[PDB]
Homo-oligomer: A and B are copies of this chain.
Amino acid sequence: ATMTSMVSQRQDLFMTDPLSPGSMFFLPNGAKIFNKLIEFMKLQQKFKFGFNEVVTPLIYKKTLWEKSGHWENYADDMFKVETKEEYGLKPMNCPGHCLIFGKKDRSYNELPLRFSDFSPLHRNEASGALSGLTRLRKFHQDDGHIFCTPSQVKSEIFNSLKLIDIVYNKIFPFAESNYFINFSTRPDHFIGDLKVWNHAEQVLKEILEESGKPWKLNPGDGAFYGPKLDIMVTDHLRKTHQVATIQLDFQLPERFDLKFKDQDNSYKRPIMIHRATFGSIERFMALLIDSNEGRWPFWLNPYQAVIIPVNTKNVQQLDMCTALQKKLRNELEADDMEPVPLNDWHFNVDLDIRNEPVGYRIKSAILKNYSYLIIVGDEEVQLQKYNIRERDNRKSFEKLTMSQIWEKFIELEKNYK
């Protein structure tokens, strides 16, 4: 029994199976949230923070991992693929993005060059370390790599902090006291020179102090390629978890011999910034469950609304419920050829017509954590209005029409509420 077990059971979110341990199954309801969080992050990355999404391979030749230093300094966590050339299943996206950078000639005008990647990653974690969605063998990162110049680093990290603030302080609050930063310094197994490393830590520390973010030193817990700014979120058992991370990399550009044409018409190395906001879609989703206990916001809820007729055998009530569900689900027939258009609204509304008392079905709804409960009795049929209430306030009853509820549910998603 873990951090997400009860809610996963109750809402049919995920599934494990001993034929692929450490990897897990997103059931239809669980996948909706997975896709919604990604959809959110893509919008922020593409239309506000200037990222360009790429899709990269999963397996690469051993020779690549030897460049990046993963093959030696990350051998404990890397899966190896075989069919006389040996391959590695990627635990990270960075080398693939380095190949992208080095494929063409790069101008200083292209910088900062930002790539994002939602590829599934594989890390051979120890069987004991495995735990729920927080630590998996397979997972997806909202990964991003920024190639920039020395004068662009400070502003790029601040931008990454802004997106982090929107996520952890505005959209998914768990102002301040939502997270603190671990200043993770040079580990025991590292690549590169100490001169470079000390410079890297100076730069990062200096930026860390301008941000004014709560922080503490986490000595010898950086990456083998660079020092990190690890966003730490605390759960209900007062245990911290690393989610978002900002990593300063002077090493991989040299390892891959990356270069760009600068203003002085000379070739210099780009500076590489590793960053993710969720960290992984899985772990971040696990920490949401730990805090909301299944009580999702409307825009994220797999159970957005349930319509409950008082008398399940009353045809008048049923027509009224059936109509609203059709309206809110907004779904076409497989009979014709009319395709589902883009940017249209579809809501996860259900219909409880089990032959059980209305009170039992309402209690059943609140247990499943439906964001809204819509009840239809005779008074509703007469008024042609639906008695809609909020999940977390049983005195939020109001009578709206089919149109009003439709427009209400839209204003909720356009406000991320």
Contacts of A31 in B (CB 8 A): 52-55
Q: Tell me whether A378 is interfacial, beta carbon within 8 Å.
A: no
Give the 3 A-B residue pairs with the shortest CB-CB distance, closest first.
A23-B57, A26-B55, A28-B52
Q: Which of B137, B331, B416 contacts A48 (CB 8 A)?
A: B331
Q: Does A203 contact B (CB under 8 A)?
A: no
B103 and A58 within 8 A (CB)? no
Whether a CB of chain B sits under 8 angstroms from the CB of A96 is: yes
Tallying the copies of this chain within the complex gives 2
Residues of A42-86 whose CB lies within 8 A of B: 43-44, 46-50, 52-61, 63-64, 79-83
- Does A267 sit within 8 A of B, measured CB to CB? no
Structural contact, A346 and B47, CB atoms closer than 8 A = yes
Chain B residues lying within 8 Å of A299, measured Cβ to Cβ, are: 342
- Selected A-B contacts with CB under 8 Å, 22 pairs: A17-B103, A20-B60, A23-B59, A25-B54, A25-B99, A25-B100, A27-B100, A31-B54, A46-B331, A46-B340, A47-B330, A79-B81, A80-B83, A81-B82, A82-B82, A163-B334, A166-B337, A170-B337, A299-B342, A341-B413, A341-B416, A343-B344
The yes or no answer to A335 lying at the interface (CB within 8 A) is yes
Tell me the minimal C-beta distance from A5 to chain B in angstroms.
14
Residue of B nearest to A43 (CB): B340
Is A111 located at the chain interface by the 8 A CB criterion?
Answer: no
Complex Cα gap A331–B331 (Å): 29
Please indicate the chain B residues that have their CB under 8 angstroms from the CB of A330 in the complex: 47
Cβ contacts under 8 Å, A24 to chain B: 55, 57
Query: In the complex, A413 Cα to B340 Cα: how many Å?
Result: 11
Please determine whether A122 and B416 come into contact, CB atoms closer than 8 angstroms.
Answer: no
Residues of chain B lying within 8 A (CB to CB) of residue A26: 54-56
Expressed in whole angstroms, the Cα–Cα distance for A50 and B329 within the complex equals 12
**A199 CB–B CB distance under 8 Å:** no
Within 8 A of B (CB), among A260-294: none
The residues in A between 126 and 174 inclusive whose CB is less than 8 angstroms from any CB of B are: 137-138, 159, 162-163, 165-166, 170-171
